[PDB]
């Protein structure tokens, strides 16, 4: 018998107002979820890369500095793994739900007025939550050098889960898994995504690797 503890946290309120608004945004152009997936993971690699210069040890947990994208049609899932700085348990609680940003209020406000477009989400510091434009439930694994590997889970409810992760070990970094929704499955099409990635890679300084999973 396997045993693990699952801690259950409750989302801040306007960052749950955000997930609500996002999952009902009948937006035609959702492809910025991937735009944000790449950027976030690029910013992560920058944090461990700039820490490299001032302390060479930080890379010892995982030498490779790259991004992997993993479309799985059978599992109905899109995975994006980076080998950046990664989050601790505290960093996941803080950065991923509980604490609100100040541009959560301002983003939703001008999304409704029309001043901001949904593709402008990343400029309000909440680019992450765009993952819910194409996914019903989002799961984040992370491994910072200062903590054990932890897994985050949310189906966009008022609620999220955190727990010590005993799945595929990451040396260091973040693995965000998108459990795609039926009407967005054409985003798992090999060519559709390939092209879409390289379209939103034209400014990325890191090696990207697209691993297409097959039946």
UniProtKB/Swiss-Prot annotation:
ATP binds at residues 40, 82, 95, 128. It is found in: Cytoplasm. It comes from the Eukaryota. Signal peptide: none annotated. Molecular chaperone that promotes the maturation, structural maintenance and proper regulation of specific target proteins involved for instance in cell cycle control and signal transduction. Undergoes a functional cycle that is linked to its ATPase activity. This cycle probably induces conformational changes in the client proteins, thereby causing their activation. Interacts dynamically with various co-chaperones that modulate its substrate recognition, ATPase cycle and chaperone function. Belongs to the heat shock protein 90 family. The TPR repeat-binding motif mediates interaction with TPR repeat-containing proteins. Homodimer. This is Heat shock cognate 90 kDa protein. It comes from Dictyostelium discoideum. The gene is hspD. The chain holds residues 1 to 215 of 700 of the full protein.
């Amino acid at each position: 018998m396997a045993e693990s503890q699952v801690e259950r946290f409750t989302f801040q309120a306007e960052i749950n107002q955000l997930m609500s608004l996002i999952i009902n945004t009948f937006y035609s152009n959702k492809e910025v979820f991937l735009r944000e997936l790449i950027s976030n993971a690029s910013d992560a690699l920058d944090k461990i890369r700039y820490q490299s210069l001032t302390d060479a040890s930080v890379l010892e947990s995982k030498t490779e500095l790259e991004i992997k994208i993993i479309p799985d049609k059978t599992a109905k899932t899109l995975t994006l793994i980076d080998s950046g700085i990664g989050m601790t348990k505290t960093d996941m609680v803080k950065n991923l739900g509980t604490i609100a940003r100040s541009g959560t209020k301002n983003f939703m406000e001008q999304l409704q007025s029309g001043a901001a477009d949904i593709s402008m989400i990343g400029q309000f510091g909440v680019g992450f939550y765009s993952a819910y434009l194409v996914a019903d439930t989002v799961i984040v694994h992370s491994k910072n050098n200062d903590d054990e590997q932890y897994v985050w889970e949310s189906s966009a409810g008022g609620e999220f889960t955190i727990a010590l992760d005993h799945t595929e070990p990451l040396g260091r970094g973040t693995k965000i898994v998108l459990h795609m929704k039926e009407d967005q499955l054409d985003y798992l099409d090999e060519t559709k995504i390939k092209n879409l990635v390289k379209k939103h890679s034209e400014f990325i300084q890191y090696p990207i690797s697209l691993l297409t999973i097959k039946e």
